[PDB]
Amino acid sequence: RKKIFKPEELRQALMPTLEALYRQDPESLPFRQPVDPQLLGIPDYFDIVKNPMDLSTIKRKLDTGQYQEPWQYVDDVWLMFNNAWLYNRKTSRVYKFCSKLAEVFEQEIDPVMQSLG
Numbered sequence: 001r002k003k004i005f006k007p008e009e010l011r012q013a014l015m016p017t018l019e020a021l022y023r024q025d026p027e028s029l030p031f032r033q034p035v036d037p038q039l040l041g042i043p044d045y046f047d048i049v050k051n052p053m054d055l056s057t058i059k060r061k062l063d064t065g066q067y068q069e070p071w072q073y074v075d076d077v078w079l080m081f082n083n084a085w086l087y088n089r090k091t092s093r094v095y096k097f098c099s100k101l102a103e104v105f106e107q108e109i110d111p112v113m114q115s116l117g
């Protein structure tokens with residue numbers, strides 16, 4: 001169950017799954033930068049969402065070797081999705097985009113997680 005990974009090998013394996021999310025347009029656009037509640041006029045955002053996450057943060061973490069094992073990366077992507085599903089209404093554009101991104105990610109990440117072990 002224990003396994004160590006070289007950060008550079010994780011980067012090469014996982015980065016295509018991240019790039020896949022960025023390539024979804026329009027669906028990735030709400031997720032490319034951290035939610036700024038003041039700028040977006042959603043002042044309750046940080047009361048609802050205790051641990052924000054977005055693609056730019058995940059990309060930086062992947063580039064700077066902050067993921068030592070693949071589930072740490074997967075956890076951040078899922079956190080991003082979970083936050084958007086929590087904060088936004090089911091009828092909303094962002095919620096619907098999130099659901100689409102989650103489908104893309106599942107298809108991308110499963111073969112990678114199999115290959116990494």
Ligand SMILES: CC(=O)c1cn(CC(=O)N2CCC[C@H](C(=O)O)C2)c2ccccc12
Pocket residue numbers: 026029030031035040042083084087088094
């Ligand atoms: C990720 C997330 O929850 C949100 C992210 N945004 C920003 C958003 O949807 N944007 C701003 C960034 C460009 C996006 C676009 O061009 O589609 C629209 C929200 C706005 C209102 C409520 C929630 C969000």
Ligand SMILES: [Mg+2]
Pocket residue numbers: 025026
């Ligand atoms: Mg489309």
